């Protein structure tokens, strides 16, 4: 489950994280292809982005880590029961349905804080109901399927 | 704990619609023109390496 077309565009992609050409990514150029697309990562953050990649703990993602990383699983039944026990966080009496607003909230304004327009899109795909609730099992299964 | 959950939820988010060419999250890269294949590439990476980040800040918290 990995072709030939596979490998050669992720291989691409290997490299235009590794501006050396020594085979290896630091936080360094990370940090320059993030800034590069507009984006301000702290120290922090690419310390902890490179950390879940190396594998060996050496503070560097080798091509075979990267592989490791393009192809873990996302949408798996380990991953699912994450996103939903996340949600369940926000779901204050445990009954399956989140607020539209309180969620829009949540979305816009803490964690990573998504924009307004990413967030129209993400409860216009749930559907509110006729009580303001989004059926949070809907994220769950669309995201994972 | 709440912000660990807001942000594995908003990164898988942002790489579940990053799949969708025409999504607005591709809206939010004002510093770059016009969107062209290396620039989808490396954006769908970083997004990828940010929900995995989030999942174990997640895990940690729950
Ligand atoms: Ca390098
Ligand atoms: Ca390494």
């Known amino acids: ?145 | 704990q709440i912000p660990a959950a807001a942000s594995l939820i908003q990164t898988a988010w942002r790489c579940y619609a990053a799949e969708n060419p025409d999504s607005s999250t591709w809206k939010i890269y004002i510093r770059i023109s016009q969107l062209r294949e290396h620039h989808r590439a490396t954006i769908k990476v970083i997004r990828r390496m940010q929900y995995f980040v989030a999942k174990k800040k997640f895990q940690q918290a729950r």
Do not use: W
């Open chain 1, 1 to 145: 489950q990995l072709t030939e077309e596979q490998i050669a565009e992720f291989k691409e992609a290997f490299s235009l994280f590794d501006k050396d050409g020594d085979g290896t990514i630091t936080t360094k150029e990370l940090g320059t292809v993030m800034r590069s697309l507009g984006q301000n990562p702290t120290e922090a953050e690419l310390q902890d982005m490179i950390n879940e990649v190396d594998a060996d703990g050496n503070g560097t993602i080798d091509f075979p880590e990267f592989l490791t990383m393009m192809a873990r699983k996302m949408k798996d039944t380990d991953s699912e029961e994450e996103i939903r026990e996340a949600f369940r966080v926000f779901d204050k009496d445990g009954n399956g349905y989140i607020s539209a607003a309180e969620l829009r909230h949540v979305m816009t304004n803490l964690g990573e804080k998504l924009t307004d327009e990413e967030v129209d899109e993400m409860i216009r795909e749930a559907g509110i109901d006729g009580d303001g609730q989004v059926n949070y099992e809907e994220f769950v299964q669309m995201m994972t399927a």
